[PDB]
Amino acid sequence: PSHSGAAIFEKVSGIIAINEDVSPAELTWRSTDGDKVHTVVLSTIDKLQATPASSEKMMLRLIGKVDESKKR
Amino acid sequence: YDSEEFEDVTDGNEVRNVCSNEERKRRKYFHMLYLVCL
DNA sequence: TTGACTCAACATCCAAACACTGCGAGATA
């Protein structure tokens, strides 16, 4: 439960599991029943957001990147 | 809003002497004002 | 720990009265 625990994405229960096995070490969110999967490559994550202790809503947010080919 | 509430948690690693006359006057005025208030 | 130097870059004080319209350039119906 260190780099892989029970995490949520799009309101469905899940199992986050960091995938550090490839050149980009990523964060694999795997639904608890397995319905929805979401892999977050920490390589692109600019900064992490954690609902601090003051944020009783314990929600962490993963700040990403704006790559030259993605800019809006 | 969302960044204001939910704090970014990260590990960003990282390894003469005389002012102008305008400041002179500003300091004199601020000195007066401050004195009066005190 | 004291203050009297010197240096240099500004800042600040202080002195204390001539008139005003003519006249040639170009252009002008």
Side-chain angles (χ1 to χ4, degrees):
Chain A
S2 66
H3 86 279
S4 67
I8 320 300
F9 176 84
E10 288 173 340
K11 313 119 188 179
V12 51
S13 301
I15 306 294
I16 254 172
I18 286 76
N19 225 94
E20 313 199 20
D21 315 71
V22 296
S23 281
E26 54 194 5
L27 172 131
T28 309
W29 172 79
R30 178 168 177 171
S31 165
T32 305
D33 316 331
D35 321 330
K36 295 184 189 177
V37 67
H38 180 68
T39 302
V40 176
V41 177
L42 292 315
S43 90
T44 58
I45 297 303
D46 185 323
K47 54 182 178 184
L48 251 77
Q49 229 89 349
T51 31
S54 176
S55 292
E56 293 185 352
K57 291 76 255 180
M58 312 181 64
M59 311 179 292
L60 282 47
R61 333 171 56 268
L62 230 40
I63 312 309
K65 226 71 176 175
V66 73
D67 299 335
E68 300 268 9
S69 301
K70 147 68 205 180
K71 265 99 92 294
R72 60 258 298 283
Chain B
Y1 204 132
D2 293 71
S3 181
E4 300 176 352
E5 308 159 352
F6 318 127
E7 276 47 297
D8 48 331
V9 65
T10 325
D11 306 348
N13 56 275
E14 207 289 334
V15 69
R16 49 174 157 80
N17 205 338
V18 187
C19 64
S20 71
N21 207 255
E22 330 162 355
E23 185 67 359
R24 189 184 199 162
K25 293 170 191 168
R26 194 198 149 275
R27 287 185 193 182
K28 194 181 210 170
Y29 156 61
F30 205 93
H31 175 96
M32 285 150 86
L33 177 71
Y34 208 103
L35 171 58
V36 181
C37 292
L38 287 164

